[PDB]
Amino acid sequence: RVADTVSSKPTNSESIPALTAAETGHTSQVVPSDTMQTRHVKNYHSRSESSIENFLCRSACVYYATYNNNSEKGYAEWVINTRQVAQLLRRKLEFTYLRFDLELTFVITSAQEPSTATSVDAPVQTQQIMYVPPGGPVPTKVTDYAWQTSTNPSVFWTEGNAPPRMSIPFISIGNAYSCFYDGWTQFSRNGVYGINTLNNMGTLYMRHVNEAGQGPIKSTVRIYFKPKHVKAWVPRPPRLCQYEKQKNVNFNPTGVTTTRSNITTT
Amino acid sequence: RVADTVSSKPTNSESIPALTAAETGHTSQVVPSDTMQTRHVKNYHSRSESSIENFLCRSACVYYATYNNNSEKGYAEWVINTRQVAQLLRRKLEFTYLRFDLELTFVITSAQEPSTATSVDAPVQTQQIMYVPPGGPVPTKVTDYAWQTSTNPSVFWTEGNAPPRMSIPFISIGNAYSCFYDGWTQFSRNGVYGINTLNNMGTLYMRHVNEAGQGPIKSTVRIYFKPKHVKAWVPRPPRLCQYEKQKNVNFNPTGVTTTRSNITTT
Amino acid sequence: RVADTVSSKPTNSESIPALTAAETGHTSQVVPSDTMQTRHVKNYHSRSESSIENFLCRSACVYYATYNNNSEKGYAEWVINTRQVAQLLRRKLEFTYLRFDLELTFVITSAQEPSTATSVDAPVQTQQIMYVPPGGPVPTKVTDYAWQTSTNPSVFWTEGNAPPRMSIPFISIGNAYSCFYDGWTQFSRNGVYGINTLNNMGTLYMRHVNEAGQGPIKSTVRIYFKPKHVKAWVPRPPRLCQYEKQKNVNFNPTGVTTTRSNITTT
Amino acid sequence: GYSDRVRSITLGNSTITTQECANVVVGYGVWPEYLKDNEATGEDQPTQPDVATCRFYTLESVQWMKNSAGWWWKLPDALSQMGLFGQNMQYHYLGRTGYTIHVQCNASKFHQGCLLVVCVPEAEMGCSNLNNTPKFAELSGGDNARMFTDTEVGTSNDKKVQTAVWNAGMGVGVGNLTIFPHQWINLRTNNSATIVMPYINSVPMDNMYRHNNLTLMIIPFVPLNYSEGSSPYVPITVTIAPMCAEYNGLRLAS
Amino acid sequence: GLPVMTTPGSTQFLTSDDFQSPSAMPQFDVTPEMQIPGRVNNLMEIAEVDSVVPVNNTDNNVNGLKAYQIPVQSNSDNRRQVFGFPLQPGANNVLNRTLLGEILNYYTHWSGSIKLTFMFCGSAMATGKFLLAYSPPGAGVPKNRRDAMLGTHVIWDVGLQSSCVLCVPWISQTHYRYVVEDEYTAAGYVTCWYQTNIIVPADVQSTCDILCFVSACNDFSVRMLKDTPFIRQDNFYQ
Amino acid sequence: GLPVMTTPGSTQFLTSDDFQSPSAMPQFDVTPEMQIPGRVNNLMEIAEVDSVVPVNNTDN
Amino acid sequence: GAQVSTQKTGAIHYTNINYYKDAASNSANRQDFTQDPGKFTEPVKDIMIKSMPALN
Amino acid sequence: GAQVSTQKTGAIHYTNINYYKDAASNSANRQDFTQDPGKFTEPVKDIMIKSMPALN
Amino acid sequence: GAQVSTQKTGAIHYTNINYYKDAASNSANRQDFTQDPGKFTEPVKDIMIKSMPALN
Ligand SMILES: CCCCCCCCCCCCCCCC(=O)O
Ligand SMILES: CCCCCCCCCCCCCCCC(=O)O
Ligand SMILES: CCCCCCCCCCCCCCCC(=O)O
Ligand SMILES: CCCCCCCCCCCCCC(=O)O
Ligand SMILES: CCCCCCCCCCCCCC(=O)O
Ligand SMILES: CCCCCCCCCCCCCC(=O)O
């Protein structure tokens, strides 16, 4: 970093740096040394913990989906999007067009279920979390042909070690991500209007690789995104009404601020 | 380092380096070679194991809090402070204003509890120890929204490996830590008087990440601080009466020293 | 490296390198080429596997003490000394004043005990082997205040990995270790006489860190010393009578050597 | 330099001259100075007031009895009502000063005794009851001396400070109170004691009504005595001078 | 990748380890350094300061300031003793509490000198001489004055800068010593005897006391850091 | 091979860690940079803008 | 390719190497601070100095 | 940045490197010894030599 | 500090580095052989050659 201050003496001229016009849409540039007489103090602070590089690059939860081991439909799937948690959604809606990388991370967990067998001794489990881009094959059971992954990228991880992590480039169609869309998808201007018209991003599948057991185990994965190299354009005001839909902007109107019992009351 | 000695011969002058006045608050500077005749021996010792850098930088226990796995309130929390153990408290109260870093360490442990199921096979457990600074969100159960940790720093560690360790800068408001405070907190000079008026330091939360079991496990964490880069100012006399309150200096008056059965008895 | 040999021819002079006097306490220096005529052969051997550096620097057992997990007095302790095993004791008593470092090593083991509960599933155990120098605090149970180790050095190790190892400087009071002492401890020349008058060396404590189980486990530690940088002075003859006391030299007189049935019998 | 035992001090408007005194102990080795413009965070301009604030304000006196234990004062609060130092203390909000403590106690060559003049930085205290905390009217007097006792504290009044002289009330060994700067008063060969203390504190400038900087303690390790036929009244007085005062944050009074 | 094996000792926790580690809060900017007066760069800076000694500690004279002053009289038969105690910093019941006794208990060894200061606090008409002896241990507690005069001693007389400093030198076979009471590495003794009576004119109280200070010299050191046995805790202070 | 030990803290997950990592899609070519007007390089750029205040907030 | 750059001090150096082929495997560009306020505050066409009156 | 400094000998060298960005990840400054006793012992104003008498 | 020294051959080189502060963390001084027999054998004052007779 911030700037210093400068020593001021009494004045009686016609400088008047105070009175201005606000109709011109111009924020003033008056410092404290202009309106009153002050000392000279050199500031040593630094605006570092507030830049967008340091402000956004922290991991946060996005979605945790679970999948039992009981039947032939144990596997679980998820469609990619970032507007499913309230904490990380609102940390994006202070800008309009972003650009970043990512570092995924999956904190997988397990748990037992009731059974009747005499003893139980469960060896370590393995996964096997797949990624299917848009317009590709799809699995329907835990013993399908799609799980070969001849070109799809998969991650195999045995329980007990550190969690898996990896990077992702700026995979998109446009020159920057779009967090707000104003317009439809059909040229006839009918049907779908919201932001999901330009959001596919692929899918995400998970599965137990072990054959079976006697428990049987149940598991829950947890995703974690961390935007790495950010770039933001066109800021906008933050949100004031709660979120209530995943792909809309619908809200319920509320007061602008909490209330005090007077205008002059402190 | 220590200094050498010097050879002295008999003297009959009026140097008198022995007799002095102690009213002037001046410690003498008489060496053994001044008062009697001695040899010349060059000391090779070194004052190294006594400097504040080597004297303080050892880890010590601070607080161990446990949390059961039974119910929805299993998690346990702790408020930061260093005056909860007697060993490390008194090793601080020989100075007044310190300045240091830290290297945390958590030696987590587990144990079983009685149950009625036939067999038991507990996979490894994971934590998940969080840090909440002052003025922030707070969790109330082991399935809350606060556990996402979008900006809070957390540590995930699976049982069986080495314990977690990390550093901490000089996080404070003043130019040095204050171990003794003389004065109140309200400008009206009423209410709270002791040292905790300028001690918040945040909180500390811990939790089991595993879903559940049949035991169920019970655990106890143990903290360990290690001041790294110390700097001390304004020493003071050590303590003589036991500690009896966490945020006071209240004591019970005791004798200055143990007693012998005479003044001339050895 | 060893020395060569030299070619000798027949002689009839008065050199007589054979006849000498042994009263002068002088070992002769006659080589085989002096007493008879021999060839010339250059030896390529090397006296390397016999120096004190290579002869002593091997680890050996010293003391194995066990501690059950059953009660509040599970912990076990040991007083430092090297004259508790016969193999490593006699490998020291060929010299008088030594000087070396050490590399400790603890091969910890476990075992089950009879119980009545239905199932048993014991997670890994941890230790926690402490070192208390002479003149310091002491623990009396497995839940004491002394186990904080604010300045004492401790070692924490989970079962299943490689064993712990560490070094130790030449920690003593004199300029070299003393393996034989001739004289008392009291100035009145009464009481204790043997070698333990100048042997304290501290203590050594061990303990289970886990809370409890259903077995419960029993364990036995094993120490291993390895003198690293040796220096020996004043050799002496080896031992001929067995050891029978830990801090004495008491013995039972035996024959100097086994017997043959004649003086001329082969 | 002739006749070391005589000093003289002219600070502002007052002057204190002693003929029989010991040396002068100057803080931790520093002389009190103003606040540089490299370590300041206030955005206003300070106010070096005058010579009218760096003067010799003399506080109350007391009698050195034959059973008295010890007295003490709180330094930034004892000068709250004295002259233009007590007006610029409450009209403003911040400030930093250093003092020049002095002490007078004179007796004939037929009396005996001793005293420990010491100032302790950041002096805490301990309430009588363990649960509660001490009062304020039992911790600081209005420039009137507070005194220790012989009996320990009793159990009253749940807010009284514990006047246990042999522990000093802070919870330390009284014999170890020679670490902080100090000077002895031995009536055999001494008549006064001077001490110059700089500003020692974590933050650069601190309030005056909310946090007391130092604490002045007087403890006679050897009680007075005298044979019959001598004056039985020996009083004590102290003279203090604020040195290098500064202030910031002008507001209304309080 | 680079193939390499791990020796024993890995995955442990030394209480006194010196290893780097990550940082919880990155890019943190601490408050700029401030310069306050008085900085303790070592723990021998504190030992070399002087502090009184509670010599006259007895049956009752411990809950008052009377345990700090040695009482001196004016008596008929000369050679009376005034005080005495063995020399053991951090071991004896007299020096185990002073400023040098509370720092010397955090360690196990020590080697150096000691400066013992006195201060006659009687009236200005008082007079007298005193003897101060330090007898190394071959046979201790000298009964007579002539038994103590053979050892190291000094003669001090009161009045006009009364305070005198006796310097206990360092005389030991080994290099260091034990703070604990060890009969192999004993130190010696310390005594003070009446070299001449206490004479006083009339109309002056004859009982006069003396204070005994203690401090460390400049060839002092310590070693083998440990934990002091004074403080003892029973449970976490709520 | 090269023998070395692992200090504590290893095999954890810091929420604010700065470490490299592999790449799922190698040899990817992002779309070339585009230059649109208005780029927020800091969060104090937004604070220095002026916004009205809801001072007269009361019962209704 | 190793660079020895500066660190974040309150008021030294620290090495760094890259080990991969792509550019999405490096670490964040935390040590970069570039400010320009003129875009949002004062977007006017005519430049206005604070001494002269605002509107004539 | 590697420095080859000295070791603690009774009476050699040992390398060292830093691997992080901050300054709180380095090791302690154990190998530093700086003494000054004049602040606590002898804080008087006039300097006193041990030969001359204390008070005149 | 790395030294490239010799090895133990029957009849090459091998590197080595130290990584700690103290001196008790290095390895043993196995590759050191120094002999002197004169102290134990032949401690006499007058030197005796094996050719001349022992005692006159
Ligand atoms: C095993 C590796 C799998 C990698 C999966 C890549 C995930 C792609 C993330 C898409 C970007 C996040 C969404 C930004 C804008 C939006 O669509 O709302
Ligand atoms: C997972 C990382 C969490 C890091 C937690 C940081 C702990 C802060 C320690 C505060 C300093 C110790 C207290 C000193 C003075 C006092 O407040 O008594
Ligand atoms: C966890 C680290 C503990 C280190 C313990 C150090 C053991 C000291 C060994 C003492 C030397 C061996 C005894 C030699 C002579 C004797 O006393 O008989
Ligand atoms: C796979 C990397 C191994 C670790 C690096 C060892 C040092 C090799 C020299 C690297 C020099 C590269 C040029 C540079 O300094 O940027
Ligand atoms: C991440 C560090 C890898 C291990 C270091 C290998 C050596 C690389 C050269 C380092 C030279 C840095 C300059 C210096 O000597 O201080
Ligand atoms: C911590 C050591 C890392 C492994 C060593 C890599 C090589 C770095 C250069 C070392 C040169 C030191 C001087 C020497 O050769 O003795």
Short mmCIF file of N, CA and C in Angstrom, two decimals, chain I residues 3-52:
data_model
loop_
_atom_site.label_atom_id
_atom_site.label_comp_id
_atom_site.label_asym_id
_atom_site.label_seq_id
_atom_site.Cartn_x
_atom_site.Cartn_y
_atom_site.Cartn_z
N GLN I 3 33.61 -36.87 -0.99
CA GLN I 3 34.95 -37.35 -1.30
C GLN I 3 34.85 -38.65 -2.09
N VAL I 4 35.63 -38.73 -3.16
CA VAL I 4 35.73 -39.94 -3.98
C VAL I 4 37.01 -40.66 -3.59
N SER I 5 36.88 -41.69 -2.77
CA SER I 5 38.02 -42.41 -2.22
C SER I 5 38.12 -43.79 -2.85
N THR I 6 39.06 -44.58 -2.34
CA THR I 6 39.32 -45.91 -2.89
C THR I 6 38.47 -46.97 -2.21
N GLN I 7 38.53 -48.20 -2.72
CA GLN I 7 37.78 -49.32 -2.18
C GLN I 7 38.74 -50.42 -1.75
N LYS I 8 38.17 -51.52 -1.26
CA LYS I 8 38.95 -52.64 -0.76
C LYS I 8 39.00 -53.74 -1.82
N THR I 9 40.14 -53.85 -2.50
CA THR I 9 40.32 -54.80 -3.58
C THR I 9 41.24 -55.93 -3.13
N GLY I 10 41.05 -57.10 -3.73
CA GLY I 10 41.82 -58.28 -3.38
C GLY I 10 43.29 -58.19 -3.71
N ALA I 11 43.61 -58.10 -5.00
CA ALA I 11 44.99 -57.96 -5.47
C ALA I 11 45.82 -59.19 -5.14
N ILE I 12 37.65 -50.26 -6.78
CA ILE I 12 37.99 -48.95 -7.31
C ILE I 12 37.50 -47.83 -6.39
N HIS I 13 36.78 -46.86 -6.93
CA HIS I 13 36.37 -45.68 -6.19
C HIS I 13 34.96 -45.88 -5.64
N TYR I 14 34.54 -44.97 -4.76
CA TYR I 14 33.19 -44.96 -4.23
C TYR I 14 32.94 -43.63 -3.52
N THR I 15 31.81 -43.00 -3.83
CA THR I 15 31.52 -41.68 -3.30
C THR I 15 30.95 -41.77 -1.89
N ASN I 16 30.80 -40.61 -1.26
CA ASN I 16 30.34 -40.54 0.12
C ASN I 16 30.01 -39.09 0.47
N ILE I 17 28.94 -38.92 1.24
CA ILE I 17 28.50 -37.60 1.67
C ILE I 17 27.98 -37.72 3.10
N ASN I 18 28.13 -36.64 3.86
CA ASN I 18 27.55 -36.53 5.19
C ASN I 18 26.33 -35.63 5.15
N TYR I 19 25.33 -35.95 5.97
CA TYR I 19 24.04 -35.27 5.90
C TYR I 19 23.58 -34.67 7.22
N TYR I 20 24.40 -34.68 8.27
CA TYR I 20 23.93 -34.27 9.58
C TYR I 20 24.83 -33.18 10.15
N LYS I 21 24.49 -32.72 11.35
CA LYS I 21 25.22 -31.64 12.00
C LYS I 21 26.35 -32.17 12.88
N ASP I 22 26.06 -33.18 13.70
CA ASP I 22 27.03 -33.70 14.64
C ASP I 22 28.09 -34.53 13.92
N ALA I 23 28.98 -35.12 14.71
CA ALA I 23 30.02 -36.01 14.20
C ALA I 23 29.77 -37.47 14.55
N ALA I 24 28.79 -37.75 15.40
CA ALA I 24 28.45 -39.11 15.78
C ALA I 24 27.46 -39.76 14.82
N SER I 25 27.14 -39.10 13.71
CA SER I 25 26.25 -39.68 12.71
C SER I 25 27.00 -40.23 11.51
N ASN I 26 28.31 -40.03 11.43
CA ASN I 26 29.08 -40.59 10.34
C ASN I 26 29.26 -42.10 10.53
N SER I 27 29.91 -42.73 9.56
CA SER I 27 30.17 -44.15 9.65
C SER I 27 31.55 -44.40 10.26
N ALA I 28 31.81 -45.66 10.59
CA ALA I 28 33.06 -46.03 11.25
C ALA I 28 34.26 -45.75 10.34
N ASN I 29 35.42 -45.61 10.97
CA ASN I 29 36.68 -45.40 10.24
C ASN I 29 37.35 -46.74 9.95
N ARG I 30 36.61 -47.61 9.26
CA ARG I 30 37.13 -48.94 8.97
C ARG I 30 38.38 -48.88 8.11
N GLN I 31 38.41 -47.99 7.12
CA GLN I 31 39.52 -47.90 6.18
C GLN I 31 40.69 -47.10 6.77
N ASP I 32 41.19 -47.59 7.91
CA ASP I 32 42.33 -46.99 8.58
C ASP I 32 43.13 -48.09 9.27
N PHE I 33 44.41 -48.20 8.92
CA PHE I 33 45.30 -49.22 9.47
C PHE I 33 46.62 -48.56 9.83
N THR I 34 46.93 -48.51 11.13
CA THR I 34 48.17 -47.92 11.62
C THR I 34 48.77 -48.84 12.67
N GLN I 35 49.99 -49.31 12.43
CA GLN I 35 50.65 -50.27 13.29
C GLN I 35 51.90 -49.67 13.92
N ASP I 36 52.14 -50.02 15.18
CA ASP I 36 53.38 -49.73 15.88
C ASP I 36 53.59 -50.77 16.97
N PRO I 37 54.53 -51.69 16.81
CA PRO I 37 54.69 -52.77 17.79
C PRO I 37 55.68 -52.45 18.90
N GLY I 38 56.49 -51.41 18.71
CA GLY I 38 57.60 -51.14 19.61
C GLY I 38 57.19 -50.86 21.05
N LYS I 39 55.93 -50.50 21.28
CA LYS I 39 55.51 -50.15 22.63
C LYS I 39 55.44 -51.38 23.53
N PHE I 40 54.92 -52.49 23.01
CA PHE I 40 54.72 -53.70 23.80
C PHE I 40 55.88 -54.68 23.69
N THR I 41 56.29 -55.02 22.47
CA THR I 41 57.51 -55.80 22.29
C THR I 41 58.70 -54.85 22.30
N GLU I 42 59.75 -55.24 23.01
CA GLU I 42 60.94 -54.41 23.14
C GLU I 42 60.63 -53.06 23.78
N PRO I 43 60.29 -53.02 25.06
CA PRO I 43 60.20 -51.74 25.78
C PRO I 43 61.49 -51.32 26.48
N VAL I 44 62.61 -51.99 26.21
CA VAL I 44 63.85 -51.77 26.95
C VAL I 44 64.38 -50.37 26.69
N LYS I 45 65.35 -49.95 27.51
CA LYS I 45 65.96 -48.63 27.35
C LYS I 45 67.08 -48.67 26.33
N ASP I 46 68.08 -49.51 26.56
CA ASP I 46 69.14 -49.69 25.58
C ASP I 46 68.62 -50.50 24.39
N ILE I 47 68.96 -50.05 23.18
CA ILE I 47 68.52 -50.75 21.99
C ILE I 47 69.40 -51.96 21.75
N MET I 48 68.77 -53.09 21.42
CA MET I 48 69.47 -54.36 21.26
C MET I 48 69.31 -54.86 19.83
N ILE I 49 70.43 -55.07 19.15
CA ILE I 49 70.46 -55.64 17.81
C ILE I 49 70.61 -57.15 17.94
N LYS I 50 70.03 -57.89 16.99
CA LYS I 50 69.94 -59.34 17.15
C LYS I 50 71.26 -60.03 16.82
N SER I 51 72.19 -59.31 16.21
CA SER I 51 73.49 -59.91 15.90
C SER I 51 74.37 -59.99 17.14
N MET I 52 74.53 -58.87 17.84
CA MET I 52 75.37 -58.87 19.02
C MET I 52 74.76 -59.76 20.10
#
